[PDB]
Design a protein around this ligand. Structure first.
Ligand SMILES: [Zn+2]
Ligand SMILES: [Zn+2]
Ligand SMILES: [Zn+2]
Lengths: 25, 32, 117, 384, 68, 93, 80
């Protein structure tokens, strides 16, 4: 189940990085 | 056929949710 | 036949148009709060109402008159000082006539004898 | 699956739909004023007309001064006592009529100015002569901005309206036409016209109005007429801030379905300028293109029509949109550069023909208008 | 502190303040407090004054029936 | 005047950029917050990862902060730069 | 105008309470407000007259205590 040359990248975050990213968007 | 006929009322009660809305639903079915 | 108009409306429906608990005796709390407003030092007229008073009352003498913030505070203080002296004089002219309650007639005499009526 | 979200296409005239246009204007209409603090101004009529003359639109149309209506021509719809009160009341003898002031709703929100009877006579005469010229075939489009009083009723004055001239015009149209369709794009509901023709199938009254807690309160979707007039009174309730694309995607399917279902012989179009953005009392977000697209779309059907101007309480915007609508009826699009008129100082700061929409929320959701147009289309199935 | 779920659509369309046109207006019944969207029951006003607004789920206090 | 009131959302550009700046400042200078971004750095820089790496990265992010906090799965796809954000607050516990 | 009733009935009681008064008639308040305004227009007429003397268009606490000085009463901590 190895996913080589991946294209979908996941960022797991708390409220701080989420609110920072929401302000960026 | 029979099972849906006997199971219609309490599955309707489950779909209604709030007991006040089911009370008014039974009031509607009584007024009919 | 005398008649008068009060509706003051030529047409009706103007809105629909397109255009056990303790109780201290009567008098008991008052002396407790005589002392509260006497040991205290704040100014007893609310600043926003009094500020608005000085603005609305000064406009007729001169148009567009601005007041320094400290200027109205000097007025606030001077007026409270003026009224507490007049009210001591009131209490004195009231206790004169075998009374505890004051009545305006007390303070028209208090002003008349001080020479501003 | 009835409402479709479509962007507002640019207004294009049809060169194969040339219409003889009759213009009804009495130079006096403007010299009347409701009051000092009043929003309704008949002065908007003559600055609209000054834009017609200075655009050179009088060379493509005939200007008429309609004969003012007498007392008993007004009584074709209204009662004798209401017209008798209207023709006799002045601001001087207002105390002599106190019972009639509250009886006929005249004195507050419909004030007594001393040119009231003459203003109503000009409006009613303009509407009736436009309908008469449509009847005899002397013109294909009759333009009369002097009227539009769609709120007036049989024995009352409401909504700054005293003489319901639109009912008189539809009455004059009914003597020669079997089916007359009345379209009201005024932001208020055409309660007087709909109430007048509620029980008849000869007149279909369609109203595109804001329906909230707004004047006149009538205009629920369930109001479809009673008796023989059932499903012959279409009410389209709208929310605040409807823009040009939304209003077009509501107006064009409904009017198209009425056209191919009711099949009228004459059309009366109430062009209320209070549907425009920035109105004093209106709450819509229509630009002048959005207001005039209704007039251009109803012009495409070829039915002999009577363009009658109604509301509009900011004079500049209603004058500009009436000038653009009038120019559209001559199969021309007026350039967005105003000519020099005597009221040029109103149209600042750009002094152009355009009425700019506000950036306020179009709260008319597609689901709500889809349900509204679905029930309207379902009610229209019985009008064949 | 929970979300007022509309009865018919079983959703609350709160919107996002970047697409406020995605927010559907919601009102509550004045009797049983059942929240309804402004589009699920066909309504354009919010019923701010006048009579209390009644949601469609309540049994009528007055009905007319045909004799036939 | 330039945009015919269609640029009203740009009236507070200074305040929103200031708030973004403040959020970045408390983003690096908070305990149990900067190591989450360090784990994001290790996940993004080291490509060719299987699923099991993704779950252990998820619980390793979870173990950094409190048990009552909210997680967010901000998915990015190189093709199309499409950022899907998912709410898994107290869901993987 | 609107602010003359802004001098409220408890405030007048507070002035009276600071003044040692136990019982107060109901008719005290409005004519006491009148006595307050006659005093205010007098003092501010003097203060503003001092203000347009100075080629000025604001009155100052200095001008207030100056008017008070003319009227006879002096206030401290407000300049002067
Ligand atoms: Zn209107
Ligand atoms: Zn819903
Ligand atoms: Zn309810």
């Amino acid at each position: 189940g190895i996913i080589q040359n991946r294209s979908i990248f996941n960022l797991f975050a708390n409220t701080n990085i989420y609110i920072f990213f929401r302000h960026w968007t | 056929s029979l099972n849906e006929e006997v199971t219609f009322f309490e599955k309707a009660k489950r779909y209604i949710g709030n007991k006040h809305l089911y009370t008014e639903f039974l009031k509607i079915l009584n007024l009919y | 036949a005398r008649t008068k108009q009060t509706a003051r409306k030529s047409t009706g429906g103007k809105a629909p148009r397109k255009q056990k608990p303790h109780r201290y005796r009567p008098g008991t709390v008052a002396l407790r709060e005589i002392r509260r407003y006497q040991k205290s030092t704040e100014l007893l007229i609310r600043k926003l109402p009094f500020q608005r008073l000085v603005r609305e009352i000064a406009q007729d003498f001169k148009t567009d008159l601005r007041f320094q913030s400290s200027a109205v505070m000097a007025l606030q203080e001077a007026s409270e000082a003026y009224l507490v002296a007049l009210f001591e004089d009131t209490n004195l002219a009231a206790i004169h006539a075998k009374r505890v309650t004051i009545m305006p007639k007390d303070i028209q005499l208090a002003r008349r004898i001080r020479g501003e009526r | 699956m009835v409402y479709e979200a479509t962007p507002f296409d640019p207004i294009t005239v049809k060169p194969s739909d040339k219409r003889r246009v009759a213009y009804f204007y009495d130079a006096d209409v403007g010299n009347y004023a409701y009051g000092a603090g009043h929003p309704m101004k008949p002065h908007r009529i003559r600055m609209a007309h000054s834009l017609i003359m200075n655009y050179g639109l009088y060379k493509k149309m005939e200007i008429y001064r309609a004969k003012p209506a007498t007392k008993q021509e007004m009584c074709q719809f209204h009662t004798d006592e209401y017209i008798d009160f209207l023709s006799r009341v002045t601001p001087d003898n207002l105390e002599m009529f106190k019972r009639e002031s509250v009886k006929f709703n005249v004195g507050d929100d419909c004030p007594v100015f001393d040119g009231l009877y003459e203003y109503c006579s000009i409006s009613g005469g303009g509407s009736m002569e436009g309908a008469a010229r449509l009847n005899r075939g002397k013109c294909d489009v009759a333009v009369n901005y002097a009227g539009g009083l769609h709120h007036a009723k049989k024995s009352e004055a409401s909504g700054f309206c005293y003489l319901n001239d639109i009912v008189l015009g539809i009455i004059e149209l009914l003597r020669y036409h079997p089916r007359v369709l009345y379209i009201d794009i005024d932001v208020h509901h055409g309660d007087g016209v709909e109430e007048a023709f509620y029980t008849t199938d000869r007149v279909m009254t369609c109203s595109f109005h804001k329906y909230g807690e707004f004047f006149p309160g009538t205009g629920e979707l369930r109001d479809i007429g009673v008796g023989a007039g059932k499903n012959y009174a279409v009410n389209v309730p709208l929310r605040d801030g409807i823009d040009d694309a939304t209003y077009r995607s509501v107006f064009e399917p409904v009017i198209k379905k009425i056209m191919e279902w009711y099949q009228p012989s004459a059309v009366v179009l109430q062009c209320g300028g209070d549907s425009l953005s920035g109105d004093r009392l209106g709450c819509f977000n229509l630009s002048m293109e959005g207001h005039a697209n209704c007039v251009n779309y109803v012009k495409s059907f070829g039915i002999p029509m009577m363009v009658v101007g109604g509301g509009g309480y900011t004079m500049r915007n209603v004058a500009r949109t009436w000038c653009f609508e009038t120019g559209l009826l001559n199969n021309v699009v007026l350039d967005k550069d105003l000519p020099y008129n005597e009221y040029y100082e109103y149209y600042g700061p750009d002094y152009k023909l355009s009425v700019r929409p506000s950036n306020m929320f179009n709260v008319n959701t597609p689901e709500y208008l889809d349900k509204v147009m679905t029930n309207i289309f379902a009610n229209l199935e019985n009008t064949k | 502190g929970k979300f007022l779920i509309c009865y018919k659509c079983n959703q609350t369309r709160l919107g996002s303040w970047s697409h406020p046109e995605n927010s559907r207006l919601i009102m509550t019944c004045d009797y049983c407090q059942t929240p309804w969207h402004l589009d699920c029951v066909p309504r354009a006003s919010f019923k701010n004054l006048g009579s209390k607004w009644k949601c469609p789920l309540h049994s009528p206090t007055k009905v007319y029936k045909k004799i036939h | 005047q330039a945009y015919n009131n269609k640029a009203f959302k740009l009236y507070t550009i200074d305040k929103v950029t200031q708030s973004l700046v403040k959020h970045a400042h408390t983003l690096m200078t908070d305990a149990k917050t900067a190591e989450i971004m360090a784990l994001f750095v290790k996940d993004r820089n080291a490509s060719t990862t299987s699923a099991k790496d993704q779950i252990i990265y998820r619980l390793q992010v979870r173990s950094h902060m409190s048990n009552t906090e909210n997680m967010f799965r901000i998915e990015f796809d190189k093709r199309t730069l499409h950022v899907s954000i998912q709410y898994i607050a107290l869901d993987d516990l | 105008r609107d602010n003359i009733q802004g001098i409220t009935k408890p405030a007048i009681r507070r002035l009276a309470r600071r003044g040692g008064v136990k019982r107060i008639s109901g008719l005290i308040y409005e004519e006491t407000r009148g006595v307050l305004k006659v005093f205010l227009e007098n003092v501010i007429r003097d203060a503003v007259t001092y203000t347009e003397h100075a080629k000025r268009k604001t009155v100052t606490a200095m001008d207030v205590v100056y008017a008070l000085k003319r009227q006879g009463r002096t206030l401290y901590g407000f300049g002067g």
